[PDB]
């Protein structure tokens, strides 16, 4: 149980490797944003903020507030699971309340896909290295509002091309686990040419294991 | 804390659960633009169309590739596809999670008294 | 920060270079039935999209 997920003990990682970085090369810049929530699955918004910052090659940020909420979410998990290796329940109730905030802002309790290159997806509803308007007013990067998409021809064209093809197009942040960075190489097409993900936990992993708050979704990517 | 499941935890009108195909106030709304398929980050949507208007003959969603991110609902320019509120559609076999045009249309016909009020609550933030 | 990789061994399975511009689905699957590897056959193939304007 204290293997922190999937670890063969040096560390023989590769138990959570999924070729994320290669899959990002086969998907446009928007389609690759959900890939960044599933890296450090305790720091989803912070993960997808670095990608957004990099793409904005190329704003809301609300991003800093939800990054701090995510920092609290990640540090709760880190400290309480460290202690468990049970406060875990005491603070996972608060984690559940934060998950409700996430779901109220995006629609999913964990993988929101909310902080997008250009700002944030939707407004807050009438809403609370390194253990606690709304979008860019450029319909060639950020999709137009649904009302304009159904009333304005340029908006409909831009909504069509930004979701089928996309837009034609390292940066590190202080993620709750350390320095989370992305080396993005564009390429000039609608899809990333290369996307390397510097995860804070990779160098840290190179029973602590608890104090390095290692999540194997980022050590393996 | 404990709530007595199955009193149920709080959710929002933006919740992203089970998908459903919707209809105009009987005609389907899907005109087969394939923008949900194009966007689908997991390639979970297989569509085929023909004159039949311009409507789909095949409209499938693989709930086992889907990451339930609502991009399709957002890409759809006609509010035809959507993530419903239903989060309790667990099955006993894998094949039941490979949806069809009939399954999705039945989902839209069953959950319509709720996926039409949730949209009305949230359509002004979109 | 493209250890550090780059193997792209630190990430691939024992006895397995995927990040070379190597097919996405690879060359071998895995199924029980121990667990054995077999040539890759996808029920639905990845649909290559031509998005470049």
């Amino acid at each position: 149980p204290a293997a922190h997920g999937v670890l063969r003990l040096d560390p023989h990682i590769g138990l959570l490797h999924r070729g994320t970085e290669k899959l990002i090369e086969y998907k446009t810049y928007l389609q690759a944003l959900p890939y960044f929530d599933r890296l450090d699955y305790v720091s989803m918004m912070c993960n997808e903020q670095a990608y957004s910052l990099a793409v904005e090659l190329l704003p809301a940020q609300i991003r800093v507030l939800f990054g701090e909420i995510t920092r609290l979410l990640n540090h709760i998990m880190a400290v309480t699971t460290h202690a468990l290796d049970m406060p875990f329940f005491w603070m996972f109730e608060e984690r559940e309340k934060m998950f409700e905030f996430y779901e109220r802002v995006s629609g999913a309790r964990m993988h929101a896909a909310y902080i997008r290159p250009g700002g944030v997806h939707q407004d807050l509803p009438l809403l609370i290295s390194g253990r606690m308007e709304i979008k860019v007013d450029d319909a060639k990067v950020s999709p137009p509002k649904r009302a304009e998409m159904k009333t304005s021809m340029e908006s409909l064209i831009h909504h069509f091309k930004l979701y089928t093809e996309g837009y034609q197009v390292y940066t590190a942040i202080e993620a709750p686990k350390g320095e989370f960075g992305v080396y993005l190489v564009s390429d000039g097409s609608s899809r990333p040419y290369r996307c390397k993900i510097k995860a804070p936990g990779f160098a840290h992993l190179a029973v602590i294991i608890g104090t390095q708050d290692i999540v194997f979704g980022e050590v393996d990517r | 804390a404990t709530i007595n499941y199955p009193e149920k935890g709080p959710l929002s009108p933006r919740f992203r659960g089970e998908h459903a195909l919707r209809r105009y106030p009987g005609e389907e709304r899907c005109i087969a633009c394939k923008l949900c398929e194009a966007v689908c980050p997991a390639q979970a949507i297989t569509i085929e169309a023909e004159p039949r208007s311009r409507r789909t003959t095949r409209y499938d969603i693989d709930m086992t590739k889907c990451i339930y991110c609502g991009f399709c609902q957002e890409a759809c320019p006609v509010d035809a596809i959507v993530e419903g509120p239903n989060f309790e559609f667990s099955t006993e076999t894998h094949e039941e999670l490979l949806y069809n045009k009939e399954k999705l249309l039945n989902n839209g016909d069953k959950w319509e008294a709720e996926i039409a009020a949730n949209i009305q609550a949230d359509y002004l933030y979109r | 920060d493209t250890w550090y990789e780059i193997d792209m061994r630190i990430l691939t399975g024992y006895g397995f270079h995927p990040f070379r511009k190597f097919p996405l689905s690879g060359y071998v699957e895995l199924r029980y039935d121990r667990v054995v590897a077999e040539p890759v056959e996808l029920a639905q193939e990845f649909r290559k999209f031509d998005l470049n304007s």
Partner: peptide, 23 residues
């Protein structure tokens, strides 16, 4: 459009042919 039937769409066609066949 090119940038604030009804049988196939340009992006999915290889290449045309789609899936082995292409108001």
């Amino acid at each position: 459009q090119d940038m604030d039937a009804f049988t196939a769409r340009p992006w999915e066609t290889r290449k045309s042919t789609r899936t082995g066949e292409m108001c």
